[PDB]
């Protein structure tokens, strides 16, 4: 294979490096000899990341939903990289948000995941884009199988579908500047994103204030019956985060970066294939394992 | 065959002032449905009332106003009583600012996402108990723009998002016998997409654009891009009834489809192109795009 040269002279900006993919990426690209700028949400996230990495790495406190903070951070990066520009932007920061049946939710429940996963990713992209153009560099967007195949109710799937759409508008707009745009679609991975207990604890808070009608339709025990089911399929979840960082690595360092990478044997052989199937067949296969409502005719 | 007792069934349609929503309100009124036509403007609803039977009611709805949506859902709940709401057609939408991504701020993305996604979701969540009651139909108007990305701006993200929400809703509602249909129109002559309106927004943005971007694209880029939009306004459907016919099948068929494609453009070019890898989409979609004056001026 043909890799790029002068990795040591190139800067990579990564969002959400406190935990998960972003943290392993910051550490992996620091070892590789890139100059990493690791955006962290929390002081302890950045202190633990600094403590584990070389002097080539800098950390910045970034909340991607704070437009002043994003603009300041882009100003800082612009001074520091000067005429090298910014070789690599990895939009990794994301949250699950509330995940529940659609008919349990209000529109406000949809706001948080869209604000981080879409608006935050867009604003960071628009603020760094002049620097990535300058370097003729790489924008890497972290999507989800949830951006090709809808999860249950909540803003996560809409936010990820939207990222897929923005990613393609950006790729086509940037082809003229020699800037490559790569979309990464991970399967299910053990990170801090998706915590069966955290997810069940949010469903229970919603249940507490849910109308009598919905409670009668689903039935008492629905939440706990559907946790016994989530836990039946927690074995088939990747613990190897490097399958995703390897994809970021190829998108950063390959002379021929792919427009889409799929991480996880789950994703390559089940989820993405299922995303190409007509809805009749997706609904058939996805609904086979769903908890029966107590009183569906109580409408 | 078709359902029975069309005359006993209510259909709520958003954005009936103009375009698909207007033709749908009129077509379903003629068909003998009891239409509740949500209009953005007083003059939109006065002209719609004036052209339709006494079976039709109009309500003033801004889908981005959550108080207005909740009030309208209360009004509908009283009026349909125990029939519930047989049909919800989420039709209301706007294009927003359409321009190269590197011209835009995040704020430019907000309006189309607020109408096309948040507005559609909030109207859906407020009417859903009534649609469950009727064991009825939710019909979401997407776009080829929700399967294949248009230029920069929030329209394509909003439409991709609708496609995602549509599938979450279909799967959540299968247990209540509620069917969910997604309509993907090609390009149609409505008030949505107006080459002159689109060019007039690009020019206002140009006026405040950084020296760097202006050098890269070059003076005349916008006007060269209008000469090109106007070269391909022949290949734009004038027959809005191709879309309302799809809504009709989704409302009245015992076997409503999960997705309808309207336009010969959409069936034979756009949707096929949406299944191709990016190398091939970018090849075909970029062939006809205005060369930048100084792309290396970065
Ligand atoms: N782990 C999985 O199974 C899947 C993960 N993904 C995506 O991978 C990306 C990374 O998440 P994971 O590493 O899995 O989880 P994680 O929660 O461990 O990492 C997400 C990161 O986002 C940061 N973050 C959250 N809100 C932020 C904000 N407002 N501003 C700045 N940073 C913020 C957190 O500090 C954290 O470092 C996300 O975009 C997620 O949607 C994709 C598909 C599924
Ligand atoms: N016309 C086309 O070629 C295409 C249209 N579509 C979709 O068709 C749908 C209907 O639009 P068209 O009839 O084509 O355009 P249009 O502009 O003629 O109709 C849109 C309707 O939405 C209403 N509306 C706009 N903002 C609103 C708000 N905040 N609250 C309530 N109502 C509001 C307007 O009053 C109007 O009646 C849209 O969702 C659009 O995205 C799909 C693909 C392309």
Numbering used by the authors:
A (entry chain A): 21 to 319
B (entry chain B): 22 to 319
Published text:
To crystallize DHRS9, we created a water-soluble form of the mouse enzyme by removing the N-terminal amino acids forming the transmembrane segment. Consequently, the final model of DHRS9/NADH complex consists of protein residues 21 to 319 (chain A), 22 to 319 (chain B), two NADH molecules and 32 water molecules. The cofactor molecule was bound in the extended conformation with the nicotinamide moiety in syn conformation and the adenine ring in the anti conformation. The nicotinamide of NADH was stabilized through the hydrogen bonding interactions with Phe209 and Thr211. In DHRS9, the catalytic tetrad was represented by residues Asn137, Ser164, Tyr176, and Lys180 (for more details). Dimerization was mediated by the interactions between two long helical motifs (helices α4 and α5) coming from each monomer. In general, this oxylipin-binding cavity appeared to be rather large (a solvent accessible volume of 974 Å3 and surface area of 1293 Å2; these values also include the cofactor binding site).
pmcDHRS9 is member four of the 9C family of the short-chain dehydrogenase/reductase (SDR9C4) superfamily of proteins. DHRS9 is an integral membrane protein of the endoplasmic reticulum. However, recently, we have demonstrated that DHRS9 is a highly active oxylipin dehydrogenase. It utilizes oxylipin substrates generated through 12-lipoxygenase, 15-lipoxygenase, and cytochrome P450 oxygenase pathways, and its activity towards oxylipins far exceeds its activity toward retinol or sterols.
